[PDB]
Amino acid sequence: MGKNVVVLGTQWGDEGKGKIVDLLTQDAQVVVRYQGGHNAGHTTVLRLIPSGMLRPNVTCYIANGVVLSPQALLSEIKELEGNGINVRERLRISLACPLILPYHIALDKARERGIGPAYEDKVARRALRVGDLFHRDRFANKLTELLDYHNFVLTQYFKQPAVDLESLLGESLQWAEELRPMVCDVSACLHEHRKQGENILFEGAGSVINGAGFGPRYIDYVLGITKAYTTRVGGGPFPTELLDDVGKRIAERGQEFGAVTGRPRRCGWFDAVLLKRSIELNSISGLCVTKLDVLDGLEVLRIAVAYKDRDGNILSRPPLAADDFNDLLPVYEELPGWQESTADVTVMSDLPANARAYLKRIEEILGIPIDMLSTGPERDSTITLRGPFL
Amino acid sequence: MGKNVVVLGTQWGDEGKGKIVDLLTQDAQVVVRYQGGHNAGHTTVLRLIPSGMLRPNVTCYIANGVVLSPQALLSEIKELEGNGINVRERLRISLACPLILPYHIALDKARERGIGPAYEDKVARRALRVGDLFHRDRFANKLTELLDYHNFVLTQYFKQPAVDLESLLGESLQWAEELRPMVCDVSACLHEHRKQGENILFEGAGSVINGAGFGPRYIDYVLGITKAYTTRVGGGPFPTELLDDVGKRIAERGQEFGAVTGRPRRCGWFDAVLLKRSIELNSISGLCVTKLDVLDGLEVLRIAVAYKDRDGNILSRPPLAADDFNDLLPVYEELPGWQESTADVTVMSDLPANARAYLKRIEEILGIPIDMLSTGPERDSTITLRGPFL
């Protein structure tokens, strides 16, 4: 009776998913984080707590696939609680979530935020988990025995400072009593929600299957949040990158700047080769296109529809290995731009004809529909052609 | 146009999946391994090569989620090749598969078959992969630099012998030229097969999603291979375990003995609490029940329909933590047995009425159909009520 929807970004991040996830929570009773750690979040800066915590009817789940720093989580809980939110009644946390602890962060540093080494412990069948907080004897004996190895690696191998065991025990003294009312078998709860016919939103940041204990055939719709152009933060291959004045104008209109560093992001044309792979890997049902108004006023637009490698071969998907992008170039289609503003448009027919043709061409190339268009920051500044939960 | 089917076991292994996977390859053009390593395989003992290698029309894929020892793989390839099979034309291997190498096996030993430490390297973004064999400079510089750490851990931490770098390079000298005609972008090939409308079988041993680069909504049917009773090999909690003469008779009739050790497996009643969780986690579409004839002639049968913990609480799913099985007991339903042989029966109406009622009760309890019944070892010794690819 209910519908189970996955929402994820389709490019390299910064697709503008925050406003869209918030909009979708209007139709969900349940919101689930199932992967990742504390990496990026909607605006307080919430990195671990799922998005629907503001809506009073929504239950929020941190499922077993999330690795979490408990002090990071309690700090978010207290920050929300200070703003009055009854967080503890509506937040639920898997007993199976592996913990991110100071030795994980230290390992990351010596190699160069703790997320990787936490997943490493899990794969090695040695990770401390939320459930271990409730067996304080086991928590201390595993923590001590884990530190014997990690501190050895940290000091005898990387010549970096150790993580003190006693101080970690002192820091963890309150964690069990603080988390206790919220811990549970999250997969069981999700399947009970599914049985009751409630709408469940899986908020992408490990798949839904393993990360939430939720079989693939129960997923009804995968929404891919997709920016009308492409951005990158890190270095490395970016075939549609613009190093010119159009790229600079996209950066300014899109406010494409690091929220912490202030460094401009790399900007470029829409890349349908990248999107083809994202669609296949995630069986994406439809797209939500964001920031279309950034392109308002450009004379021409380009869309990369293929890649041509160094040998001149035509590629329909990005190559697997990063070194294979060396001497690789995009194959572009050209579409005419528009001059009228598309900002805050609320009905498709109000868009200029060339904006609608741009959106139609993306649909034709990718073979899936654009079911949502975001034209500005407000919630009602969205066109929904087909609702993910309908 | 095609159908994409996942086949997996629903209990603790030894569900008898080999004959069933072989039967399903009659209807598949493509068979994919997407997880695990070389742990168990159908009867030559094939541990890495997917099951449909005997059928001439079938292409077999080892997708990126498989970790593989190359010498183990080449040994299977040569063993098949000696029996005449044109393996290299029909076997395809992901460039992204992480390698299992001697240092992984050594790490496993010092902790106490290399599969775990291989996945550990992958999570730490340091794993050697099949694709690295084709950049011999990189392969050697990564291998040397990986060994500096692993041998340090092996000798300075576990006081165990090191893995010699030079001898590993010598052993790997042929691997690239031997594997070269078979390596590819496996996810891309699978999506091209899906586009051509070909039936794809995913052979369960990481999910299909990440392990094969294949989105969840493309999965059309999940077949759960399920023994008519439960078995366990290892120690630990087994709520329906029989320690009596019925358990011993099940062990003998089912030939439930370790293929290598000869040790009898632990045997017990069918456990629908275990199956409920397997169904939810894997969104299982229907079951293939195996070894029903093992129960021929028993006076009564039992099915565990709930658990009761130490406090007397009734559980519908197995608890998450292993320590929570302490002082836990199954809640049984009792059904009458049958005396007539069900071995090699080919039409449901030929089964005794009590055998059909047993199967009907399992369906009622679990809420999904029994779509296939295996009544013996031959291929035509199967009743197919609904074909996974139909």
mmCIF file of N, CA and C in Angstrom, chain A residues 9 11 13-21 225-227 288 290-291 374:
data_model
loop_
_atom_site.group_PDB
_atom_site.id
_atom_site.type_symbol
_atom_site.label_atom_id
_atom_site.label_comp_id
_atom_site.label_asym_id
_atom_site.label_seq_id
_atom_site.Cartn_x
_atom_site.Cartn_y
_atom_site.Cartn_z
ATOM 1 N N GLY A 9 21.960 11.803 -5.353
ATOM 2 C CA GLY A 9 22.546 12.666 -6.376
ATOM 3 C C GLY A 9 23.222 11.850 -7.473
ATOM 4 N N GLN A 11 25.624 13.030 -9.827
ATOM 5 C CA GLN A 11 26.837 13.597 -10.452
ATOM 6 C C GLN A 11 27.971 13.456 -9.444
ATOM 7 N N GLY A 13 28.233 15.254 -6.446
ATOM 8 C CA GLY A 13 27.830 16.005 -5.275
ATOM 9 C C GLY A 13 27.365 17.414 -5.614
ATOM 10 N N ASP A 14 26.799 18.082 -4.604
ATOM 11 C CA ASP A 14 26.334 19.468 -4.735
ATOM 12 C C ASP A 14 25.246 19.590 -5.800
ATOM 13 N N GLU A 15 24.463 18.534 -5.976
ATOM 14 C CA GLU A 15 23.356 18.588 -6.926
ATOM 15 C C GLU A 15 22.158 19.357 -6.384
ATOM 16 N N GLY A 16 22.222 19.835 -5.140
ATOM 17 C CA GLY A 16 21.114 20.568 -4.548
ATOM 18 C C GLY A 16 20.011 19.686 -4.002
ATOM 19 N N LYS A 17 20.367 18.551 -3.392
ATOM 20 C CA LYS A 17 19.385 17.579 -2.916
ATOM 21 C C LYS A 17 18.644 18.018 -1.648
ATOM 22 N N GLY A 18 19.175 18.981 -0.892
ATOM 23 C CA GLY A 18 18.603 19.278 0.417
ATOM 24 C C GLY A 18 17.156 19.742 0.363
ATOM 25 N N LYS A 19 16.886 20.768 -0.440
ATOM 26 C CA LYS A 19 15.522 21.268 -0.597
ATOM 27 C C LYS A 19 14.577 20.180 -1.099
ATOM 28 N N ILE A 20 15.072 19.293 -1.960
ATOM 29 C CA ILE A 20 14.211 18.275 -2.558
ATOM 30 C C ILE A 20 13.874 17.194 -1.541
ATOM 31 N N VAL A 21 14.858 16.771 -0.748
ATOM 32 C CA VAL A 21 14.566 15.787 0.284
ATOM 33 C C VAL A 21 13.552 16.355 1.271
ATOM 34 N N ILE A 225 18.655 13.233 -8.227
ATOM 35 C CA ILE A 225 18.764 14.689 -8.210
ATOM 36 C C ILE A 225 19.950 15.087 -9.069
ATOM 37 N N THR A 226 19.700 15.971 -10.032
ATOM 38 C CA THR A 226 20.616 16.214 -11.140
ATOM 39 C C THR A 226 20.671 17.707 -11.423
ATOM 40 N N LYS A 227 21.859 18.280 -11.344
ATOM 41 C CA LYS A 227 22.036 19.685 -11.653
ATOM 42 C C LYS A 227 22.029 19.862 -13.161
ATOM 43 N N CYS A 288 15.173 14.713 -10.927
ATOM 44 C CA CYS A 288 14.805 16.048 -10.466
ATOM 45 C C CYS A 288 15.952 16.950 -10.915
ATOM 46 N N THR A 290 17.855 20.459 -11.069
ATOM 47 C CA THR A 290 18.007 21.633 -10.216
ATOM 48 C C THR A 290 18.837 22.704 -10.917
ATOM 49 N N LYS A 291 18.680 23.946 -10.438
ATOM 50 C CA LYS A 291 19.506 25.098 -10.847
ATOM 51 C C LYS A 291 19.457 25.369 -12.352
ATOM 52 N N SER A 374 13.389 21.890 -10.154
ATOM 53 C CA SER A 374 13.576 22.900 -9.117
ATOM 54 C C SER A 374 14.018 24.192 -9.787
#
